[PDB]
Design a protein around this ligand. Structure first.
Ligand SMILES: Cn1cc(C#CCn2cnc3c(c(/C=C/C(N)=O)cn3CC(=O)Nc3ccncc3Cl)c2=O)cn1
Ligand SMILES: Cn1cc(C#CCn2cnc3c(c(/C=C/C(N)=O)cn3CC(=O)Nc3ccncc3Cl)c2=O)cn1
Lengths: 123, 123
């Protein structure tokens, strides 16, 4: 009938999902990146990453509780991207850009990769 | 270091969460409303509703897979609100406003209740 749009709702949801992550509430996977580990919600990972979408949509892998990433992936770059997934904010710096871009390619995050390219273009 | 804001990210996440709901992927609770049932992600419910937050944050209830709502709750009003949670869009109409408002009070959704009040004020 009469539709009403709430402009802050999606950001408020994402904030609250991040609050749950910070309390480890209903997290259902650990992502292992070399010597570090990061806990998350599979649904958020799938929503933000083609790699995680492809993993958890397969019935064969959906119920995995631990995912080991490629040993070459930089844990800092992963952490930057995980925080982006839950905040919409990307901490890109000359000192991290290459690792973040390579990690975003691996995670299949095309908009982040494109933004990294724009960052390179802007020096 | 250098922070970059992605303005469409939160809405894109929510869209993808709704796509998962529509495929029943990683849904982990059924909400029973009289003769109808609705499947959802607990994390989204907790993010959007004080009632569901209070239920699932308690360790006693966190692992419940079925929640029976009060038998007085209107399934249409619940469905409208569940769709709002996953879309940011509220379908309010003269024919549903009272049931939606009462349901939003029960679900502890203050911004929706306030919007219902504004709808009443605007006739
Ligand atoms: C080498 N290389 C490959 C790539 C790539 C790619 C394509 N690509 C696939 N998938 C994606 C993104 C994405 C956005 C991330 C961002 N902000 O950049 C989020 N996803 C998951 C998704 O679409 N999930 C979904 C779909 C439908 N229904 C339910 C769900 Cl959960 C995404 O960008 C970059 N470099
Ligand atoms: C009788 N009556 C009582 C009320 C009420 C109330 C307060 N109230 C409590 N809770 C809420 C809302 C809310 C917004 C919904 C909307 N769009 O209107 C979302 N929540 C869950 C939440 O804050 N979750 C959360 C918090 C912290 N950390 C993690 C998480 Cl998941 C919320 O409005 C209305 N009528």
């Amino acid at each position: 009938d009469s539709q009403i749009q709430f402009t802050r709702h999606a950001s408020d949801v994402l904030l609250n999902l991040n609050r749950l992550r910070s309390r480890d509430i209903l997290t259902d996977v650990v992502i292992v990146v070399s010597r570090e580990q990061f806990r998350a919600h599979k649904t958020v990972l799938m929503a933000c990453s083609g790699l995680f979408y492809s993993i958890f949509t397969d019935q064969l892998k959906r119920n995995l509780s631990v995912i080991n990433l490629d040993p070459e992936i930089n844990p800092e770059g992963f952490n930057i991207l995980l925080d982006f997934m839950y905040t919409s904010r990307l901490n890109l710096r000359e000192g991290n850009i290459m690792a973040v871009m390579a990690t975003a390619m691996y995670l299949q995050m095309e908009h982040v990769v494109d933004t990294c390219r724009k960052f390179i273009k802007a020096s």
